[PDB]
Write a protein that binds this DNA or RNA. Structure first.
Ligand SMILES: NCCSC[C@H]1O[C@@H](n2cnc3c(N)ncnc32)[C@H](O)[C@@H]1O
Length: 394
DNA sequence: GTTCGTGTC
DNA sequence: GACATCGAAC
């Protein structure tokens, strides 16, 4: 995934279209395997262009035009009919935590250039917006990117943008990059029309085959899910979990790190600051320490008020599943979701926990969100259906 | 307040 | 595969 597998390249080329003599671009091209593959497949009567930032990487055939620039700050003379490629992925931030390292002034420039830039954001998001803006009307884009933009908040504006700028086809590939931890999708964007079509794929020796899954003709940027009749059925059967509960996150690690009550060793009256490694399906391991942090249990409420109260805990970083337990002791947590019943909500804690851990709930989330992200996110959690057995809003 | 991507066994 | 980041980001 500084290299794309040949069958991914070929799959993408099979989705790509350009008029005769039309302008074809590969951003972050290096040696330009997408331009090479498109030319092998469709011939030579096109204008082939490759943008690369690193002169050690730029190595195009003499029939293509190579440009040494930052694709994201680059201002071409003319727009393009087709843009295809594999964007660089990663968060721009401090080298101690994040992979992309640019001067603050450059990231300032990126944030000014991109209307979709939200939160920490990502290089692959910036690349997608850049490319759509360099398309002529009716132009086509074919990119391979992580799947995380289908569901995540950072990419809400990117999704709204794509829905507003034309028509979108999404093909799920999954973990198709050897030795890279990512679930991938192929986007086919065309700068005209509207709506969204979602596709699954089939992988053979002959390569990838698209399987039409679902169509959203009036898509506006809504989260993208693999919906079935079964998932729809379960979703109407109860109240959304978010209507019953206030959903809060744990206090972060540095909040605890600097609190005068928190120690780095166990001792009299001291209790471990819990993490996801303490949370199990239906129970909490209060004994083990995984954070390296101890504090008096009674002092936990100074970090979050709700730490003083027995409440429901749901997992965030165990993949796309629902792992829940009742925290009857009310301990300090460094991780996970913390759910507080809304005014007039009658709950049955053990019966609700039991339902959230159930195999029915596991399939449900795995069907909708697959392996897009290594998390149960707030957006997935709040839409979980809860029938009257487990919680009732009077 | 809380988000996001591998990191390490 | 297991089993989850954890803190700089806003
Ligand atoms: N398309 C192949 C994978 S992405 C890796 C390539 O993207 C290039 N790259 C990363 N950021 C870039 C940018 N902002 N503009 C142009 N090329 C970039 C790298 O130099 C590298 O050759």
């Amino acid at each position: 995934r500084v290299e794309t597998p040949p069958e991914v390249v070929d799959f993408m080329v099979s989705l790509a279209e350009a008029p005769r003599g039309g302008r074809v671009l590969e951003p972050a091209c290096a040696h330009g395997p997408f331009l090479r593959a498109f030319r092998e497949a469709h011939g030579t009567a096109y204008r082939f262009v490759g943008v690369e930032i690193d002169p050690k990487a730029l190595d195009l055939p003499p029939w293509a035009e190579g440009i040494l620039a930052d694709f994201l700050l680059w201002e071409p003379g003319e727009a393009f009919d087709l843009i295809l490629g594999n964007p660089p992925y990663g968060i721009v931030g401090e080298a101690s935590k994040y992979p992309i390292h640019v001067f603050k002034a450059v990231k300032d420039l990126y944030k000014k250039a991109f209307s979709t830039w939200k939160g920490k954001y990502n290089l692959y998001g910036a690349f997608l917006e850049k490319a759509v803006r360099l398309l002529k009307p009716g132009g086509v884009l074919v990119f391979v990117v992580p799947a995380t933009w289908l569901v995540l908040e950072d990419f809400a504006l990117l999704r709204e943008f794509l829905a507003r700028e034309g028509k979108t086809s999404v093909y799920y590939l999954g973990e198709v990059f050897p030795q890279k931890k990512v679930s991938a999708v192929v986007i086919r964007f065309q700068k005209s029309g509207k709506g969204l079509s979602l596709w699954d794929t089939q992988e053979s020796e002959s390569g990838f085959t698209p399987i039409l899954w679902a169509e959203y003709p009036h898509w506006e940027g809504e989260i993208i899910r693999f919906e079935t009749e079964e998932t729809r059925k379960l979703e109407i059967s109860g109240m959304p979990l978010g209507d019953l509960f206030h959903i809060r996150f744990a206090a972060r690690s540095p909040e605890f790190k600097k609190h005068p009550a928190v120690r780095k060793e166990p001792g009299p009256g001291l209790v471990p600051v819990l993490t996801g490694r303490n949370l199990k399906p239906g129970w909490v391991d209060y004994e083990k320490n995984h954070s390296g942090l101890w504090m008096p249990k009674e002092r936990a409420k100074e970090l979050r008020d709700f730490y003083a109260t027995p409440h429901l805990v749901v997992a965030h970083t165990k993949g796309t599943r629902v792992v829940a337990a009742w925290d009857e002791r009310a301990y300090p947590w460094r991780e996970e979701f913390h759910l507080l019943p809304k005014e007039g909500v009658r709950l049955d804690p053990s019966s609700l926990v039991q339902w959230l851990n159930s195999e029915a709930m596991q399939k449900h989330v795995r069907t909708l969100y697959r392996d897009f992200v290594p998390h149960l996110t707030l957006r997935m959690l709040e839409r979980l259906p809860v029938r009257r057995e487990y919680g009732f809003h009077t």
